[PDB]
């Protein structure tokens, strides 16, 4: 299936009493794998299958790198607030990562945000930075003048990031590569007088990716469908739903991990 590795950084200027100035977390698929912040100043595993397969020297090495990345984030945020002539508390965020999809093709991404809005987006295929406004355009110019750094990021996204992801996927295979099929049920109920609601509800499934839709007479999709969010149930599995109002033959169609399911409403 499709797997992903990504690392986030968050910087906050002038934080309130309990908010770290810097936080960095890594994920494989929906699973946190690592954490670091300016309070602990220590990189720590967040998944047992990461802790069990990476020796202390690894955590020590990346702790040192994160302490540098924290300092660099602090300075970059100070410079961004200056460009915007902003005071008070503002945020800076980074996301880097890659995906390995089913057909063996890969994606890679690297992006920055200021105050929670897109700021700079790297396109590894053209080796350029897309900027949202003139302040970002200023930073883009500097970064695009360093040809070698652009090439380095392309190599990291396309080769290194994928190799690390495959390594972690093997470490966590009993978790990340398992399948728990959904339990699916259809409920009908008259609500407002003369208005029948149909709910198709799924829970207990892993991975979280699931397709749910309503069809009419087998061929056509129903017009106004309401979709529930895919929500963690807290035990490692997820839940979701889709609903319609009935007015001739309706069915809920569910696809999860290569298995299709149909629930006809009698």
């Amino acid at each position: 299936r499709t797997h992903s590795l990504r690392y986030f950084r968050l910087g906050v200027s002038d934080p309130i009493h309990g908010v770290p100035e810097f936080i960095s977390v890594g994920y494989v698929d929906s699973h946190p794998i690592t954490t670091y912040d300016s309070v602990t100043r220590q990189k720590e595993p967040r998944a047992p299958w990461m802790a069990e397969n990476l020796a202390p020297d690894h955590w020590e090495r990346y702790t040192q790198l994160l302490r540098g990345w924290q300092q660099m984030f602090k300075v970059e945020l100070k410079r961004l607030q200056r460009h915007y002539n902003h005071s008070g508390s503002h945020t800076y965020q980074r996301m880097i990562g890659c995906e390995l999809l089913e057909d063996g093709s890969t994606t890679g991404f690297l992006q920055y945000a200021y105050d929670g809005q897109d700021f700079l987006i790297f396109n590894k295929d053209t080796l350029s930075w897309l900027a949202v406004d003139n302040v970002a355009h200023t930073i883009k110019q500097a970064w695009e003048a360093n040809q070698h750094e652009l090439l380095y990021q392309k190599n990291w996204l396309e080769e290194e990031c994928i190799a690390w992801l495959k390594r972690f996927l093997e470490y966590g295979k009993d978790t990340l590569q398992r399948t728990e099929p959904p339990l699916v049920r259809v409920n009908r109920k008259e609500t407002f007088p003369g208005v029948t609601a149909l709910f198709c509800k799924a829970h207990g499934f892993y991975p979280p990716e699931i397709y749910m839709t309503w069809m009419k007479n087998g061929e056509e999709i129903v017009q106004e469908i309401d979709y529930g969010d895919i929500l963690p149930s807290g035990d490692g599995t997820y839940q979701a739903w889709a609903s319609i109002e009935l007015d001739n033959l309706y069915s809920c169609h569910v696809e999860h991990s290569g298995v299709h399911m149909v629930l006809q409403v009698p």
Partner: antibody, heavy 109, light 114 residues
Framework: GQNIDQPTEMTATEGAIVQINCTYQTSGFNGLFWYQQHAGEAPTFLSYNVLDGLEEKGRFSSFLSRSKGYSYLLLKELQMKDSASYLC??????????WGAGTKLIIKP | GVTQTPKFQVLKTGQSMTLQCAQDMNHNSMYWYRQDPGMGLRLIYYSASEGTTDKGEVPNGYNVSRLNKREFSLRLESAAPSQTSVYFCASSVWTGEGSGELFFGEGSRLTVLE
């Protein structure tokens, strides 16, 4: 373990070319550097490669093949002043530099 | 760019010694290497950023202080003959990610004698 190999010494003739090879065996790869170090002096940065191809800087060019795991430093129109040691360094998957033991280049006038 | 002292020093076994390094390039990462015949540079200690340091490959017999953003001192607590070497301090804009190169000091030649 990880290894980076370059010849101990090379000898070539004034006016000619020389190709100094650097092969590396690492779990991952984040770039290859060449440094020049004249005897009794400090190393100075010459070149960096991280994708495949040949990058020219005057009389010096540096080549990388990621799939073959090697690089070379090419010196054209050799001069006596090119006599020096040439150091290769690879940044591994944890961004640490592994250093080759250096290649002393001797030029025959 | 990178200033290290002293260029030459003779020490007696067991003596204490501090090598100084300063860089006026606003770099965040600094490094202490030893260079010995027949082998690649070996990292002794490094400092990814102001306020942190960590061992390299050959830390035993040494320690360091990242005094401030500019300065990275290398101490020999009790000099041993095997610490006869050429010592190089270096800095880079950042460490870890990136294509950034090292900038090297002129080198310190230390000879330790009984």
């Amino acid at each position: 373990g990880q290894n980076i190999d370059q010849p101990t010494e090379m000898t070539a003739t004034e006016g000619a070319i020389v190709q100094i090879n650097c092969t590396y065996q690492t779990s991952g790869f984040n770039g290859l550097f060449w440094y020049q170090q004249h005897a009794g002096e400090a190393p100075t940065f010459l070149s960096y490669n991280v994708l495949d191809g040949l990058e020219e800087k005057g009389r010096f060019s540096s080549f990388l093949s990621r799939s073959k795991g090697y690089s070379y430093l090419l010196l054209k129109e050799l001069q006596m002043k090119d006599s020096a040691s040439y150091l290769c360094a690879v940044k591994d998957s944890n961004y640490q530099l592994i250093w080759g033991a250096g290649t002393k280049l001797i030029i025959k006038p | 760019g990178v200033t290290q002292t002293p260029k030459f020093q003779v020490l007696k076994t067991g003596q204490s010694m501090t090598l100084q390094c300063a860089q006026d390039m606003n770099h965040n990462s600094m490094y202490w290497y030893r260079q010995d015949p027949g082998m690649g540079l070996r990292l002794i200690y490094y400092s990814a950023s102001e306020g942190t340091t960590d061992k390299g490959e050959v830390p035993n017999g040494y320690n360091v202080s990242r005094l401030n953003k500019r300065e990275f001192s290398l101490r020999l607590e009790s000099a041993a003959p095997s610490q006869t070497s050429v010592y190089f301090c270096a800095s880079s804009v950042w460490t870890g990610e990136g294509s950034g190169e090292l900038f090297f000091g002129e080198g310190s030649r230390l000879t330790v004698l009984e």
